[PDB]
Amino acid sequence: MKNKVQLITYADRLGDGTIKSMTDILRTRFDGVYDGVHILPFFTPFDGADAGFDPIDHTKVDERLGSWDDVAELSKTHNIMVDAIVNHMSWESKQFQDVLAKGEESEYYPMFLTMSSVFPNGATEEDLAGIYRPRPGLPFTHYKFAGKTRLVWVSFTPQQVDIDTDSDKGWEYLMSIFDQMAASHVSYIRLNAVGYGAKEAGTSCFMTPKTFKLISRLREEGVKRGLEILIEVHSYYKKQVEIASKVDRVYDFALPPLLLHALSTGHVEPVAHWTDIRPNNAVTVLDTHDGIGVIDIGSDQLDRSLKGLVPDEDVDNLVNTIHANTHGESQAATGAAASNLDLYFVNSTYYSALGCNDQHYIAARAVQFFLPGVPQVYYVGALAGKNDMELLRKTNNGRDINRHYYSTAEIDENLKRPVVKALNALAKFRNELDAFDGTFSYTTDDDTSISFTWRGETSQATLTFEPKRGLGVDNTTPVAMLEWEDSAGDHRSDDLIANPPVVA
Numbered sequence: 218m219k220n221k222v223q224l225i226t227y228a229d230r231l232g233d234g235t236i237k238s239m240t241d242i243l244r245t246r247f248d249g250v251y252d253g254v255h256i257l258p259f260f261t262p263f264d265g266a267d268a269g270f271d272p273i274d275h276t277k278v279d280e281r282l283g284s285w286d287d288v289a290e291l292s293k294t295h296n297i298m299v300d301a302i303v304n305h306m307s308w309e310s311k312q313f314q315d316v317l318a319k320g321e322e323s324e325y326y327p328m329f330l331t332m333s334s335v336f337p338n339g340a341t342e343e344d345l346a347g348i349y350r351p352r353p354g355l356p357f358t359h360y361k362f363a364g365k366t367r368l369v370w371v372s373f374t375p376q377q378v379d380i381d382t383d384s385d386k387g388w389e390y391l392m393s394i395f396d397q398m399a400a401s402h403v404s405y406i407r408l409n410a411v412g413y414g415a416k417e418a419g420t421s422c423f424m425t426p427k428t429f430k431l432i433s434r435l436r437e438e439g440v441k442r443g444l445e446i447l448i449e450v451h452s453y454y455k456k457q458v459e460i461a462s463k464v465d466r467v468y469d470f471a472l473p474p475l476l477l478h479a480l481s482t483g484h485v486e487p488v489a490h491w492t493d494i495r496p497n498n499a500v501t502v503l504d505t506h507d508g509i510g511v512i513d514i515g516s517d518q519l520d521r522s523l524k525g526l527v528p529d530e531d532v533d534n535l536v537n538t539i540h541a542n543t544h545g546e547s548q549a550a551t552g553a554a555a556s557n558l559d560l561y562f563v564n565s566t567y568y569s570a571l572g573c574n575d576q577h578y579i580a581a582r583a584v585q586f587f588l589p590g591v592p593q594v595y596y597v598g599a600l601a602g603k604n605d606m607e608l609l610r611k612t613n614n615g616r617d618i619n620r621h622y623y624s625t626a627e628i629d630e631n632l633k634r635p636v637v638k639a640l641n642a643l644a645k646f647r648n649e650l651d652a653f654d655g656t657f658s659y660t661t662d663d664d665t666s667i668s669f670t671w672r673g674e675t676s677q678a679t680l681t682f683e684p685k686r687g688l689g690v691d692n693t694t695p696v697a698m699l700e701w702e703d704s705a706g707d708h709r710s711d712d713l714i715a716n717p718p719v720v721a
């Protein structure tokens with residue numbers, strides 16, 4: 218993966234509402250800022266219950282958004298990342314409807330997992346209770362195979378039936394997806410829900426040896442087609458390290474909340490610890506298309522004795538801090554859970570989670586860019602967007618607080634703001650200075666300061682982070698200082714908003 222900043226966006230929520238418009242925005246307004254882009258699911262349909270992640274036909278671009286030729290066109294100027302939903306598919310797919318019609322006579326019967334698929338001999342209460350769950354309840358629902366009531370395996374909504382990733386038909390399906398991506402010049406694949414894609418009795422059916430075997434298989438097929446695979450998993454952080462040593466790339470989901478903690482308390486010891494131990498084959502983010510993950514720093518939710526990177530009280534305090542900084546906006550969008558340790562994500566734009574403090578936000582982005590890994594910027598964050606309460610009240614979908622629809626006009630108006638221009642200049646600095654292609658190091662004081670240094674063949678840079686200097690949501694004191702050396706000698710910026718860095 219190129220070591221350049223990428224954009225995460227919906228095709229229809231950035232510009233006029235099409236892949237062509239999104240491409241035009243990227244090329245005309247973010248040249249040199251975002252040299253790659255992760256296009257969120259744009260298949261048929263993109264506007265269902267789960268904003269494109271519940272496709273009926275994963276292989277056809279929604280004709281309202283564009284075509285695969287548009288993806289091919291975009292690939293000529295940007296590296297493209299796309300999702301591959303490998304664990305399940307719509308119960309409204311033609312295949313599953315065929316299984317409902319013909320049952321075991323269906324050509325696609327072996328393609329879908331049932332309880333009997335995994336437990337041909339019966340299952341114990343321990344067998345079923347031990348399955349790792351993103352949603353409450355057992356992963357089964359009732360469907361009728363031509364007349365016969367069957368329990369279909371469903372890791373998520375009952376409308377998303379899980380496929381047998383080990384069957385010939387299922388694998389054929391996955392490889393059809395891979396063949397289209399490969400045919401439209403996509404570079405990177407984000408394997409959605411891949412950790413659940415392998416089922417085996419007596420195990421958690423989540424990131425087991427079988428799951429890793431599946432991932433490696435998909436990897437070989439990808440490289441055979443020129444597609445690199447990215448793994449997405451929200452889990453207890455130690456499991457994240459473990460998984461990261463076994464795959465090409467994972468997300469760094471701990472950093473966003475770690476930076477919220479640092480900027481709200483001034484403590485940097487957790488950030489230094491995570492820096493020391495984190496997996497470096499990472500994609501770094503602050504905001505995503507989902508809510509802010511708190512489980513990723515995370516007392517283990519199956520065994521609360523394995524403590525996270527901060528005490529549980531600091532986790533509760535983090536959630537409450539987002540609530541306070543947003544003056545209750547996130548409370549309206551987050552479902553209450555009777556205890557903040559039970560929470561999975563907190564629905565708020567990152568900029569809003571910081572109380573819209575420009576200095577804090579630009580500092581967070583700087584840290585993100587200085588840690589090993591490819592940085593991604595979510596489009597809302599690319600425009601320093603606030604919580605969209607109108608859309609939330611319209612749809613009652615919590616996550617929509619962080620999924621504002623930006624018209625071209627709105628984009629151009631927000632591009633005049635100093636913090637946005639500071640982020641653009643910062644991403645240019647991160648994309649153009651070759652120091653970041655060299656070697657990484659860092660120093661720490663005890664709890665006040667931490668300095669990340671990259672040294673390269675023709676440049677060097679050190680970012681010093683000291684949140685202790687600028688406490689307060691209304692604070693305007695810079696909390697990040699930057700020194701770097703390029704063609705023009707040594708340079709220093711003590712305010713990344715007022716004095717964004719420019720490489721010679």
Ligand SMILES: OC[C@H]1O[C@H](Oc2cc(O)cc(/C=C/c3ccc(O)cc3)c2)[C@H](O)[C@@H](O)[C@@H]1O
Nearest residue numbers: 267270350351352373409410411449451507561
């Ligand atoms: O399609 C369903 C969703 O898939 C992805 O989200 C995931 C993908 C995944 O592999 C695991 C999870 C985990 C949920 C979860 C985890 C731990 C827990 O304790 C409770 C719940 C979420 C997309 O990004 C999201 O937009 C989409 O809606």
